[PDB]
């Protein structure tokens, strides 16, 4: 009863010499809602959320470079590669003011973009977003050994690239209900060839955990500082027990982030969109009219 289909016409735009695929539905003009997915997903992640928003608002949901149906350039796929390509995607569409609905590395992208263009963002809805993790102590045990293994050049690449462990292992573990084979196949699709799994490996290696990578730590601290100061309307979805944003961190953020409404989505881990897309979509639709 959670839709497995992806009923959106493909759109492609030429960005820095590569084609990037994106969803584009709703009204053809006006403030768009920009959906940014993270690892190891694609615009597919928003398939059940978009239909709640698209009646009233243009919806745009790109596949990040090297992911989903986007082209696969021979890049190192650092977070900085993702920044360059998303910045260029936004301009290629000539987007002006936007609302962001962001998740995971998409949240790192969203917040980083919002910090650099504060006058162009009308609101931010986020869930399970990237914040600095001071120590492995704070990383949930059930996945601690796994992610520490991910974050090596030898064992980590063997797991993620050669064994597709991020897709076959971490993905379904990040969802409370069991993903169906049909859903898994949509998610496996961009990564059928081991060669195409570079971004899947570099991404966990970019997580700001115990002060490394230093450049990502400083960058994520900068947008966290910007968030605690910014009057931008915020909608924060959180699950129980959650992974990146546990119930107690949500509660704190509700107080320390200005203009921040929170929504309890019930049981949830990493991919909150795969556990309760109905409430996330409906709560976004309810939130939008209050923006403008
Ligand atoms: C407990 C670990 O949580 C995760 C779980 C449980 C599943 C997935 C797919 C991802 C993560 C982590 N998020 C992530 N790793 N690299 N880029 N984003």
């Amino acid at each position: 009863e959670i839709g497995t289909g992806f009923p959106f016409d493909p759109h492609y735009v030429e960005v820095l010499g590569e084609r990037m695929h994106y969803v584009d539905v709703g009204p053809r003009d006006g403030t768009p809602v920009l959906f940014l997915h993270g690892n190891p997903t694609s615009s597919y992640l928003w398939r059940n959320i978009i239909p709640h928003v698209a009646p009233s608002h243009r919806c745009i949901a790109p596949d990040l470079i090297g992911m989903g149906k986007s082209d696969k350039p021979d890049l190192d796929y650092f977070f900085d590669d993702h920044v360059r390509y998303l910045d260029a995607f936004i301009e290629a569409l000539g987007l002006e003011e936007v609302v962001l609905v962001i998740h995971d590395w998409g949240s790192a992208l969203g917040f980083h973009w919002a910090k650099r263009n504060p006058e162009r963002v009308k609101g931010i809805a986020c869930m399970e977003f990237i914040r600095p993790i001071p120590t492995w102590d704070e990383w949930p045990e059930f996945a601690r050994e796994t992610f520490q293994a991910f974050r090596t050049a030898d064992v980590g690449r063997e797991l993620i690239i050669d064994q597709n462990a991020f897709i076959e292992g971490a993905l379904p573990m990040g969802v409370v209900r069991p993903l169906t084979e049909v859903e898994m196949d949509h998610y496996r699709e961009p990564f059928l060839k081991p060669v195409d799994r570079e971004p899947l490996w570099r991404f966990p290696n970019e997580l700001p955990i115990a002060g490394e990578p230093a450049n990502i730590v400083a960058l994520v601290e900068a947008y966290m500082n910007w968030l605690h100061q910014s009057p931008v309307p915020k909608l924060l979805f959180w699950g129980t027990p959650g992974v990146l944003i546990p119930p107690a961190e949500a509660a704190r953020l509700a107080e320390s982030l200005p203009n921040c409404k929170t929504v309890d989505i019930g049981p949830g881990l990493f991919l909150l969109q795969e556990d309760n897309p109905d409430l996330i979509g409906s709560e976004i639709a309810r939130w939008l009219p209050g923006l403008a």
Side-chain angles (χ1 to χ4, degrees):
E1 44 92 0
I2 285 172
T4 64
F6 191 73
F8 304 99
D9 297 330
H11 305 269
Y12 296 99
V13 60
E14 263 295 304
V15 178
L16 305 165
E18 311 291 327
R19 284 208 331 272
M20 291 186 39
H21 169 280
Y22 69 101
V23 172
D24 191 7
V25 293
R28 298 294 77 231
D29 55 23
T31 309
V33 185
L34 184 50
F35 296 81
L36 302 185
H37 71 85
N39 212 41
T41 50
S42 68
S43 60
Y44 189 77
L45 178 65
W46 307 109
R47 75 205 182 271
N48 293 319
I49 307 287
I50 288 157
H52 291 265
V53 184
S56 69
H57 275 83
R58 183 174 183 200
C59 295
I60 297 159
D63 292 337
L64 298 176
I65 186 77
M67 290 169 76
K69 289 175 161 291
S70 294
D71 268 6
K72 308 175 177 300
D74 181 34
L75 309 177
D76 287 318
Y77 292 103
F78 281 98
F79 170 83
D80 184 79
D81 294 314
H82 284 288
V83 170
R84 170 179 349 113
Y85 277 86
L86 175 65
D87 281 7
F89 166 85
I90 285 168
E91 303 305 303
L93 261 49
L95 301 185
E96 271 193 309
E97 300 168 276
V98 303
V99 176
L100 305 166
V101 175
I102 60 186
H103 176 261
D104 191 48
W105 277 109
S107 71
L109 288 169
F111 288 141
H112 184 52
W113 189 89
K115 180 206 68 177
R116 291 174 302 139
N117 305 272
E119 69 288 359
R120 305 169 57 178
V121 6
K122 292 314 108 189
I124 309 169
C126 51
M127 51 223 77
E128 283 292 301
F129 63 83
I130 307 284
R131 273 183 332 115
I133 305 282
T135 57
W136 283 107
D137 298 44
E138 311 219 70
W139 188 274
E141 188 279 327
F142 79 97
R144 183 188 299 139
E145 283 166 323
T146 298
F147 277 72
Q148 292 171 337
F150 282 1
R151 290 168 60 94
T152 63
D154 35 44
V155 164
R157 294 181 69 80
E158 100 204 328
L159 284 184
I160 293 174
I161 298 186
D162 288 338
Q163 297 174 20
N164 205 10
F166 207 99
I167 294 292
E168 301 295 355
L171 170 71
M173 135 187 287
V175 181
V176 166
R177 55 107 170 170
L179 292 174
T180 63
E181 230 167 358
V182 173
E183 294 162 316
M184 290 290 282
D185 286 340
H186 280 277
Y187 284 129
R188 295 168 162 139
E189 207 180 324
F191 308 105
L192 290 175
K193 298 189 174 69
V195 321
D196 297 327
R197 296 165 192 162
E198 191 67 33
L200 295 197
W201 172 85
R202 177 57 75 172
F203 261 176
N205 278 275
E206 292 273 78
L207 297 170
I209 302 169
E212 305 171 1
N215 77 299
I216 299 300
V217 167
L219 180 151
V220 169
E221 290 181 348
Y223 72 61
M224 285 320 288
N225 291 330
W226 171 85
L227 207 50
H228 283 91
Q229 139 241 290
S230 163
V232 72
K234 305 162 194 75
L235 184 51
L236 174 56
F237 298 90
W238 58 276
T240 300
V243 163
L244 304 185
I245 310 293
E249 178 63 30
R252 289 187 290 266
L253 292 164
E255 255 62 55
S256 73
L257 300 179
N259 215 340
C260 183
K261 175 179 186 83
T262 73
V263 173
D264 191 338
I265 73 110
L269 284 162
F270 174 60
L271 295 183
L272 307 185
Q273 307 87 348
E274 296 297 6
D275 271 307
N276 202 351
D278 286 6
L279 187 68
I280 297 176
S282 72
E283 288 296 306
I284 289 174
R286 277 158 99 273
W287 170 69
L288 296 167
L291 295 187

